[PDB]
Design a protein around this motif. Structure first.
Motif, PDB file in Angstrom:
ATOM      1  N   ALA A 194      -2.387  -7.257  -6.458  1.00 38.72           N
ATOM      2  CA  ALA A 194      -2.656  -6.131  -6.064  1.00 38.72           C
ATOM      3  C   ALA A 194      -2.736  -5.284  -4.638  1.00 38.72           C
ATOM      4  N   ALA A 195      -2.965  -6.398  -3.801  1.00 43.19           N
ATOM      5  CA  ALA A 195      -3.100  -5.760  -2.363  1.00 43.19           C
ATOM      6  C   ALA A 195      -2.429  -6.787  -1.331  1.00 43.19           C
ATOM      7  N   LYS A 196      -2.239  -6.483  -0.261  1.00 42.06           N
ATOM      8  CA  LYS A 196      -1.691  -7.268   0.724  1.00 42.06           C
ATOM      9  C   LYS A 196      -2.962  -8.227   1.258  1.00 42.06           C
TER      10      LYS A 196
ATOM     11  N   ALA B 109      -8.446  -3.700   1.022  1.00 40.38           N
ATOM     12  CA  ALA B 109      -7.595  -4.297   0.054  1.00 40.38           C
ATOM     13  C   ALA B 109      -8.255  -5.529  -0.862  1.00 40.38           C
TER      14      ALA B 109
ATOM     15  N   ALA C  12     -10.273  -3.367  -3.432  1.00 35.93           N
ATOM     16  CA  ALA C  12      -9.300  -3.205  -4.598  1.00 35.93           C
ATOM     17  C   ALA C  12      -8.510  -4.326  -5.194  1.00 35.93           C
ATOM     18  N   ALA C  13      -8.744  -5.332  -4.440  1.00 37.88           N
ATOM     19  CA  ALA C  13      -8.065  -6.577  -5.222  1.00 37.88           C
ATOM     20  C   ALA C  13      -9.176  -7.110  -6.174  1.00 37.88           C
TER      21      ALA C  13
ATOM     22  N   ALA D  83       0.247   2.603   1.646  1.00 38.61           N
ATOM     23  CA  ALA D  83      -0.464   2.599  -0.222  1.00 38.61           C
ATOM     24  C   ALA D  83      -0.136   3.699  -0.599  1.00 38.61           C
TER      25      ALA D  83
ATOM     26  N   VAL E  86      -4.254   1.800   3.785  1.00 37.75           N
ATOM     27  CA  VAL E  86      -5.000   1.015   2.482  1.00 37.75           C
ATOM     28  C   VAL E  86      -6.350   2.153   2.203  1.00 37.75           C
TER      29      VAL E  86
ATOM     30  N   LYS F 261      -7.895   5.283  -0.477  1.00 38.52           N
ATOM     31  CA  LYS F 261      -9.003   5.408  -1.335  1.00 38.52           C
ATOM     32  C   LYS F 261     -10.130   6.200  -0.962  1.00 38.52           C
TER      33      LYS F 261
ATOM     34  N   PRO G 208      -2.288   0.004  -3.775  1.00 35.08           N
ATOM     35  CA  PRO G 208      -2.410  -0.145  -2.195  1.00 35.08           C
ATOM     36  C   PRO G 208      -1.066  -0.908  -1.656  1.00 35.08           C
ATOM     37  N   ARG G 209      -0.325  -1.775  -2.452  1.00 37.49           N
ATOM     38  CA  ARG G 209       0.871  -2.148  -1.980  1.00 37.49           C
ATOM     39  C   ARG G 209       1.964  -2.157  -3.015  1.00 37.49           C
TER      40      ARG G 209
END
Lengths: 95, 92, 92, 92, 92, 95, 92, 92, 91, 91
Positions: C25-27, C51, C54-55, G3, G49, G53, G76-77
């Motif tokens: 989902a994210a870094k 991140a 959002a993860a 992002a 990121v 949002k 995001p990524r």
């Protein structure tokens, strides 16, 4: 609502019981650089803020418009944890 | 002897969020945590009483927002024999 | 140091799918897992604040498909004392 | 990265027949078992994407027959970070 | 490929009396026991396929008179990958 | 309600959820010339103000008498985009 | 791999006000717009990121006062293959 | 020849999130998108047959959260004569 | 040469049709024509029996995954059509 | 400078809406953007208060003809928009 960097904590044992369990924090307004330059003001946490974090604390009659801060007597409270502060399109602050 | 503050949570996150907010609220040393298995975990903090008493009261409020929270208690003056026989840090 | 994201599942599978979805989902940096015993396991991720949020709320949704999800919470910046006493990576 | 197949049973016996049926139903490699405590046990298999999907669905038929199946899931191509930090057999 | 017999019982006593009844019923080798936490334990026996079939269904009728019998099962040929990754007494 | 020039943006990821979707702005009070002369203060936007625009930000208990700013915890919000400032009949500021 | 945030509105004025307020609300590079025909217009934003949002959450609320708004989502990524195979800017 | 996967969506946003979760699901190649006007947009991927099966199904579950999904289809062996005229990444 | 077409409100339905068509007979897929509004039209060419057999596979195969609008077959298009419309066989 | 936009599901509605805006206040009509599917959009620019009074003079003049999707006024679009969208005033 003003920028601020947390500096410390205040501990009271004899306080109005409506507020017990509130976390009292010490914030100084900071210039948009993270360098604290101001006077110490106390505020309760509602976001889980810790020492060394840059925050926004709202003040006054509108500092109670949040649960676990309702009809409690509080005139300054934190409500956010900054992540970056832009100025004119060049970032002046990061996490 | 340093005071004693404890929070016992069914989850694990309950302890952490409780552990942090306990530290952020007063001058306390998070001294470790004790896993009794079966999911039950207990965080242990120690320090001056008025500090623990604020952290403890704060830790409860911070963990309940996750749920669970089994027990919350504060020992002001542990007997010397406790600190010697149990893993609360301040053990010689 | 970095922020904190935690997911706690009553089943090893749910956590794995929760873990895999989180990194995808994210870094974010996956550090490992801490078994609290009695079924319950906990996934631990760490990284910048937005991140993780959002993860997690993408992991929590990605874990509810398989089974129950005990707790999900996010710490933006753990107090220095935690990192030194809990296996949250980033310990000195 | 090889796929990922997992079977989580509340009885060590349930896991085994589930494991055997998998390595008997498709060209899969069985890494091991992860006991999360509390009677919960997790078998982990890795291999081609389809074989895993065929193995799990072929194992579950055997495990519900002699055990409380808890979770059955497949992750087609897990992240590098997962295999790098978690004990799922494809660790460098 | 030495066959495999298993019995999983919630409680220590059930495992023993079930085990003792097995090794007395036919020619099989009791290799050990596995503690999965949460009170569940599992006895493991290896030998020729006819013994376990006669051994297990003798332990069941002997454990059923003591404790909660979870599951009872027999595998006539564990895939060599099982015997390699699992503690079943035949790892090379 | 104070004269003001927008200077920058603040982004909070951990914030009191009642406010999410609100646009946080950084304003410095300005003389009626566009010359910013003050300290940075944060306030929420309700009019769609952007960086470099001269605005009026209301402050205090009355900063919530605006839709999507009601029982939210906020003590300062924008309410206007200035267009001209008179002094004795001589314009000191234009668009 | 900054992002990615997107807003899709059936009208057109909706996109612009969404495009504007998304930029005015955080440090973002407005990257262009994509006409999918049938009237549907889509704004595409990219940046750090935590900013996307905030713009996204702000643009949704800012366009709704004009109406419609079909979809709103934030990545995001993005995978390397996305930015390379589709016109979302960051294509080398 | 390499397989073929297709998602059609009434909304550009749907296609992206469909694309993102797809390449993240299995090892497939995202070759582009095709605009039929009217707001209808189609994502196209190629790769192994087993992957497309798993990738496509990861998109529908990922796109249904956003926009309405028109069609979801999978092509194992597309004829040689097709890949010549249509923009499916394998044009010689 | 003869003609054959399928149009399916949905670019997917067209492709699955084109496969089944090419896979079903000895026909040449010329391309596809996008009419806007989500409607797209596939075009195949070849012997009549091939087309008349190919298209039947197309309608039956796209109806499973598509909203089929129209399906038709021309055994001999007048010379003028090929001159104006883009149906491959255009000198 | 400021911004004015009016969006009609009909080419006619946009024109009269445009004309009324120019005739109402000191504004510059810059062009129009076809979003496809019928919908078209007028774009004007000028001082803020004129646009606000220009639009509410155009919306009024388009309400006579047919439906009007949207009417909006941006007092000063961020510099980054003007550089990426066809709203005239590009660098």
């Amino acid at each position: 609502m003003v920028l601020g960097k947390v500096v410390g904590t205040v501990v009271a044992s004899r306080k109005e019981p409506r507020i017990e369990g509130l976390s009292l924090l010490l914030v100084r307004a900071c210039d948009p650089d993270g360098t604290p330059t101001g006077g110490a003001v106390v505020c309760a946490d509602a976001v889980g803020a810790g020492v060394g974090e840059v925050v926004l604390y709202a003040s006054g009659s509108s500092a109670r418009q949040t649960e676990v801060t309702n009809n409690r007597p509080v005139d300054a409270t934190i409500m956010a944890i900054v992540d970056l502060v832009e100025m004119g399109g060049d970032v002046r602050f990061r996490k | 002897a340093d005071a004693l503050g404890m929070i016992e949570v069914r989850g694990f996150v309950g302890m952490v969020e409780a552990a942090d907010a306990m530290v952020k609220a007063a001058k306390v040393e998070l001294i470790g945590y004790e896993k009794t298995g079966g999911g039950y975990v207990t965080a242990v903090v120690r320090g001056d009483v008025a500090a623990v008493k604020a952290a403890t009261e704060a830790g409860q409020r911070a963990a309940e927002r996750v749920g669970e929270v089994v027990a919350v208690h504060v020992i002001p003056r542990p007997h010397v024999n406790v600190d010697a026989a149990l893993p609360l840090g301040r053990t010689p």
